[PDB]
Design a binder for this molecule. Structure first.
Ligand SMILES: [Br-]
Ligand SMILES: [Br-]
Ligand SMILES: [Br-]
Ligand SMILES: [Br-]
Ligand SMILES: [Ca+2]
Ligand SMILES: [Cl-]
Ligand SMILES: [Cl-]
Ligand SMILES: [Cl-]
Ligand SMILES: [Cl-]
Length: 675
């Protein structure tokens, strides 16, 4: 009869391997754009010079030829442009065919069909479906990344490291991107079919999915619950009843899965690193090289003038009016791709921030903004440049405010404090790569103030005493907080110095929680004399209002009879008692390896409602939740559990221990898995 497709061999393993998509847990045919893939078609007969096969690929709810969301191409003897099929061999009934997509094809789920011309007739038949992703390996693809190690880190790595803490002590927390985990790739592709853009106009949305810029920006909006459409609900209040403490999460895996499982209902709760971590997973899964960026002393300039204000009262109390405008640290992402809309000079790292902080075009989205651009004050380019620039270059201005007198007065200005130690995990290790030199020119330099002037212009057309708060003891939850305020007159005389001090528990962003300590004193020092006022806060005094942030704002407003007040400020971090993970034998694939979780309660009282949360791609399947018996005071807890490796190489086991007295204690262990 007429020619017909009897069966088809997609050579999934072969092609996924060549397309660098053989890591995804999915059994589907995952492919990358602008690159060939081979299929074997077993026909019911031989092919004739009179016949003809035409392939039909299409994506989205309105496959359109003129939108690239649909293409029809001839099985040829030579390759053409865009989509194409090439007959490489015809052994009797079976046909070896090479198909290729254009480097600019929309990414997403496609369907394949065949229209056979044979013996004066015509027939069609669906062949199958496949996923087409961005090709960071393809030189002509906007997301191209030439270096092997780099591309392996920013695309193939599913174990991450995010820097947190303060400009006083940079710490890190492990993060499970797990883009290769079950259902993850799929869910992330689902995100694009749930965006405001897609509801507004599905056809145009799908057609724009061939652009990393569009896909980037959309994701920065959909990773957050905001706009009544998104994944993670932010919360910086210190009260997380109804959801989960932002600091307890360990990956993007259970977050994205819960999203789906819950019927697309907001996952609770998240804070900036949670957004960046989850966004990174979505970016990397789709094929956009991405990395997590952490900026210390990050400013949120509510009004474009590259200047944020923070206030205090004469009593040393931090005021709310601007106490969260300068986060101890804020995290975001960077996508790697060219900017055809900006020029050759602005390609490279692009800023993407899914944290609902500033409204953009009426929506809670942010980016992509050229990092090279941000470094040049070319703030008029898209997107959200003014916001991100101030986020790293804004001037910090302190103010004293008297509630009674109503008066308000400027205390000191600082343009070096904001934007410090901008960090990101290093390629191949847990080292800290500092990329400050990428966002701005060295502070205290011509280029600094030049770019800053250029920016502000494009956007907006004698003390006597020295203060210094210092830690004096191992700061830790459960231990008393010992500090010492250092003062010293510099002038030649004996001054009388009044000091108003307070201590508040806060969230890392600056949200004021509650006062846990305060005190006043007066002291007169002789010329060049150095004083030491000890500050002591007991556990009982702060444990009540200390949040998972384990942070306390310490302030000291000092004043001399006829001078200006010297504001001495310092945020501290208390460490959690240690949580340990131990492998008990050599780790090998498909071979069970016993692990131990060890914890010791330092308190005088026991800790209750203990739960152990463990996970790690390649080591475990999903998350492992374990109820831990109440642990008495000064006692130790040993919990054993077996894990079964699935992939070899260096894997990351992450753990979380939570109990009423100690929310979110993290643990991390690199495990080498033998083949
Ligand atoms: Br909203
Ligand atoms: Br909030
Ligand atoms: Br500290
Ligand atoms: Br498992
Ligand atoms: Ca949103
Ligand atoms: Cl290649
Ligand atoms: Cl999947
Ligand atoms: Cl870099
Ligand atoms: Cl690690």
């Amino acid at each position: 009869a007429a020619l017909g497709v009897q069966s088809i061999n997609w050579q999934t393993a072969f092609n996924r391997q060549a397309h660098h998509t053989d890591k995804f847990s999915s059994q589907e045919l995952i492919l990358r754009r602008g690159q060939n893939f081979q299929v074997l078609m077993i026909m019911n007969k031989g092919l004739g010079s009179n016949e003809r096969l035409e392939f039909i690929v299409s994506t989205g709810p309105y496959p359109s030829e003129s939108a690239m969301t649909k293409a029809v191409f001839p099985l040829s003897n030579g390759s053409s442009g865009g989509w194409s099929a090439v007959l490489q061999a015809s052994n009797g009934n079976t046909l070896t065919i090479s198909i290729s997509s254009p480097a600019s094809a929309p990414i997403g789920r496609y369907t394949m069909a065949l229209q056979i011309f044979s013996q004066g007739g015509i027939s069609s038949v669906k062949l199958g479906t496949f996923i087409l992703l961005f090709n960071p390996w393809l030189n002509v693809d906007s997301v191209f990344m030439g270096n092997h190690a780099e591309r392996e880190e920013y695309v193939q790595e599913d174990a991450g490291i995010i820097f947190v803490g303060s400009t006083n002590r940079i710490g890190m927390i492990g993060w499970n991107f797990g883009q290769f985990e079950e259902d993850i790739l799929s869910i992330c592709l689902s995100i694009l079919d749930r965006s405001l853009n897609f509801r507004r106009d599905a056809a145009t949305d799908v057609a724009s999915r061939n652009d990393p810029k569009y896909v980037g920006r959309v994701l920065s909006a959909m990773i957050n619950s905001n706009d009544d459409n998104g994944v993670l609900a932010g919360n910086w209040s210190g009260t997380y009843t109804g959801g989960r403490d932002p600091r307890s999460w360990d990956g993007s895996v259970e977050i994205l899965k819960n999203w789906k499982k819950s019927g697309l209902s907001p996952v609770r709760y998240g804070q900036c690193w949670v957004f960046a971590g989850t966004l990174n997973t979505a970016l990397r899964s789709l094929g956009i090289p991405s990395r997590v960026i952490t900026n210390f002393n990050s400013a949120h300039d509510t009004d474009r003038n590259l200047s944020v204000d923070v206030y205090y009262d004469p009593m040393g109390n931090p005021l709310d009016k601007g106490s969260d405008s300068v986060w101890n640290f804020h995290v975001w992402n960077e996508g790697w791709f060219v900017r055809s809309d900006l020029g050759p000079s602005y390609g490279g790292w692009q800023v993407l921030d899914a944290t609902p902080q500033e409204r953009s075009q009426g929506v809670f989205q942010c980016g992509p903004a050229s990092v090279i651009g941000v470094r040049e004050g070319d703030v008029q380019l898209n997107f959200d440049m003014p916001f991100i620039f101030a986020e790293v270059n804004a001037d910090r201005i302190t103010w004293l405010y008297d509630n009674t007198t109503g008066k308000q007065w400027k205390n000191s200005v600082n343009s070096h404090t904001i934007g410090r130690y901008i960090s990101t995990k290093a390629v191949g290790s847990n080292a800290r790569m500092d990329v400050t030199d990428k966002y701005k020119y060295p502070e205290g330099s011509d280029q600094e103030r030049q770019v800053f002037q250029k920016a502000l212009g494009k956007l907006k057309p004698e003390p006597s005493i020295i203060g210094k708060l210092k830690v004096a003891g191992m700061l830790a939850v459960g231990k008393e907080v010992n500090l010492v305020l250092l003062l010293k007159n510099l002038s030649r005389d004996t001054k009388t110095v009044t000091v108003n001090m307070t201590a508040w528990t806060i969230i890392y962003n600056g949200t004021l929680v509650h006062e846990v300590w305060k005190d006043s004193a007066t002291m007169s020092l002789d010329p060049e004399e150095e004083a030491e006022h000890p500050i002591k806060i007991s556990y009982a005094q702060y444990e009540r209002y200390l949040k998972s942030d384990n942070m306390i704002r310490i302030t000291a407003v000092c004043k001399v009879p006829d001078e200006s007040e010297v504001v001495v400020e310092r945020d501290i971090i208390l460490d959690n008692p240690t949580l340990t993970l131990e492998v008990l034998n050599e780790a090998r694939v498909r071979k069970p390896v016993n692990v131990q979780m060890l914890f010791s309660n330092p308190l005088d009282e026991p800790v209750r409602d203990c739960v152990l949360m463990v996970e790690g791609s390649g080591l475990l399947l999903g998350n492992l939740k374990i109820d831990v018996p109440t642990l008495g005071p000064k006692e130790r807890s040993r919990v054993r559990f077996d894990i079964l490796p699935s992939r070899s190489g260096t894997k990351q086991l992450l753990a979380d221990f939570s109990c009423n007295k100690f929310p979110a204690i993290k643990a991390m262990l690199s495990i080498d898995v033998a083949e």
